[PDB]
Write a protein that binds this DNA or RNA. Structure first.
Length: 292
DNA sequence: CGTCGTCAAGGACGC
DNA sequence: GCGTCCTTGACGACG
């Protein structure tokens, strides 16, 4: 057993002055603005991925802002054709250099909504995520939360299932779900996976905060079963003494050992404000453990 | 250049 | 009913 764990971080790299998560405001919407910001995000993303490889960070969560406002209903810009060259170039690199990709389209995606409008708009946002990834000629996972709780859980869960079951292939095939710190725990997520085949992503912090008494190694074991290929997870840490769920501004290098050491054969996304810096710490610990 | 009013969006919460 | 906080607070008009 050589490698088997990848490390990633999210959206952009601060230590590089090359923002890849620039968006724009509806008042600016036009073909020119969209292309300009889309090109600069993508030029930076190439760079960010070149730097990641250089520093043995082969996992990355792509910003949803990459093509700003792409899902907005007033948005009608043919970014797929215009930007096809860069987009292909970034994908070829991702695949040539064995990089894992994910996206996390945000909180406005409630696929189990009671309001149809929000379902349809949720699907458009997912559509953009899938379109982006195809445009790079890559697979990738799109992670989301189960969504709302209205009318209690098992209706909510079924609203999720019924809707999931209706999505187009090339969204559903990328879709994985994450456990949260309020409503839907892992046990719930598994409930869904069992009925859907949806891969579950374990967010460690949301789980130590909302569990049914599953120990880390028990929880992992069950999730693993929901993945065809190699599981992803989200690793975050608490910000000391806050109303729990607040992401630490960086990772504690010891907490990370304790954790990564009861685990192999997964890729880890780091959810912390200082982004690449924690990625570097994460790369140290694993290099040390021969698990990178 | 620097300041700061405003930002597409759902849903849950505390007031 | 309104303000707040949620992958990463930052866009961009105005002087």
């Amino acid at each position: 057993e050589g490698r088997h764990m990848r490390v990633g971080y999210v959206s952009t790299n601060y230590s590089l002055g090359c923002k890849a998560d620039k968006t724009i405001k509806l008042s600016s919407l036009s073909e020119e603005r969209v292309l300009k910001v889309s090109s600069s995000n993508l030029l930076c993303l190439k760079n960010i991925l070149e730097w990641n490889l250089k520093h043995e960070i082969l996992f990355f969560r792509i910003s949803s802002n990459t093509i700003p406002l792409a899902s907005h209903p007033k948005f009608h810009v043919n970014w797929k054709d215009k930007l096809s060259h860069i987009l292909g170039d970034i994908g070829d690199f991702i695949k040539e250099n064995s990089i894992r990709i994910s996206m996390h389209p945000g909180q406005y995606v409630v696929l189990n909504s009671v309001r149809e409008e929000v379902v349809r708009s949720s699907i458009m946002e997912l559509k953009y995520h899938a379109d982006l990834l195809d445009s790079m000629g890559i697979e990738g996972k799109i992670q989301i939360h189960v969504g709302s709780s209205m009318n209690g859980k098992e209706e909510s869960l079924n609203r999720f299932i019924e809707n999931f079951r209706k999505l187009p292939s090339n969204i559903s095939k990328r879709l994985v779900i994450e456990n949260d710190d309020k409503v839907f725990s892992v046990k719930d997520c598994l409930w869904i996976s069992e009925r859907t085949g949806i891969p579950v992503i374990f967010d460690n912090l949301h789980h130590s905060i909302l569990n049914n008494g599953e120990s880390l190694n028990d929880a992992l074991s069950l999730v693993r079963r929901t993945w065809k290929d190699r599981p992803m997870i989200d690793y975050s840490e608490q910000e000391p003494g806050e109303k729990p769920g607040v992401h630490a501004t960086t990772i504690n290098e010891e907490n990370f050992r304790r954790f990564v050491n009861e685990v192999d054969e997964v890729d880890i996304m780091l959810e912390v404000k200082d982004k690449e810096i924690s990625a570097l710490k994460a790369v140290k610990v694993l290099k040390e453990l021969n698990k990178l």
